[PDB]
Amino acid sequence: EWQGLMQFTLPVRLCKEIELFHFDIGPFENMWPGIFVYMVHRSCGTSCFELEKLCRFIMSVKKNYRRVPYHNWKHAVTVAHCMYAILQNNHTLFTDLERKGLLIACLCHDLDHRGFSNSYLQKFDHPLAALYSTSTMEQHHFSQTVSILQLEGHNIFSTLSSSEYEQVLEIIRKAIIATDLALYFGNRKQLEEMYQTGSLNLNNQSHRDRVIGLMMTACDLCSVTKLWPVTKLTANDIYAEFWAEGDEMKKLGIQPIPMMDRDKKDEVPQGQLGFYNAVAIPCYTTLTQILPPTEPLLKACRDNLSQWEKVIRGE
């Protein structure tokens, strides 16, 4: 599988399509690993990584995504693409280290997800919960990523010094961690303060780290920024998963929260409207103020919000 991927070229008609934020990968399934390769070449160059090791990696990574309805291989590619799109529109912002790691981080950010939130894991005493007390799944995702690097001929970062090596793993570590929604609220709130007092400074490493955190979350949630038909269907995949976690609580005899209860299909529209207002819109709003080129995300997020309102009011 890994040998045939090196001989892949992206069809010319997509070269320009990919660059857009609202580009949907849904119909290009057997090309997804190629599209990732493509994204790394444009974003770094062919000289950056060793092609042989890079292909083994993407296939291993692919292998360890599970057949869950939403936290799967399609979602990893979708998220990676959004990060690509961000980086290409902010070419001057990031160091060579950041560009590389961040794409890797996005690809691996939900490795070996089982379909369960941190709550369900910390509630019913899962082994992972015993190991990882905070950011449970997120620390595991990083475990998985490190273990895949350490396989034979999978270490894509071979050609870097000790110093450069542990820098990029720290970037990847904190990035993947920042994908937990619990930390987004703090992070985002700290960044609004620093922008409106004008104390934000990207020379400051801890300020850079906060921004990258927000970029992760913006990328993670980017399915709310696609065109309406795609966003609509991606929602069905999210709730299928929410509802399966809820049916694991019903099996014991417990009513889950309304979000995870399939008896309340009828409230999904309102659930979305709530989620856009409290989470999605402030995310892209704050991202845009720090990185104006990412305005198209905010625009798209707004358009879908309207659409859910029309649904709510019966149109």
Ligand SMILES: COc1cn(-c2cccc(C(F)(F)F)c2)nc(-c2ccnn2-c2ccccc2)c1=O
């Ligand atoms: C009500 O609809 C939705 C609720 N959540 C959500 C998720 C967790 C916690 C909470 C908390 F805020 F309730 F804590 C809300 N996430 C999404 C969503 C849209 C895109 N990715 N994504 C997502 C993000 C993370 C996990 C699953 C899905 C969503 O559409």
Ligand SMILES: [Mg+2]
């Ligand atoms: Mg995750």
Ligand SMILES: [Zn+2]
């Ligand atoms: Zn994710």
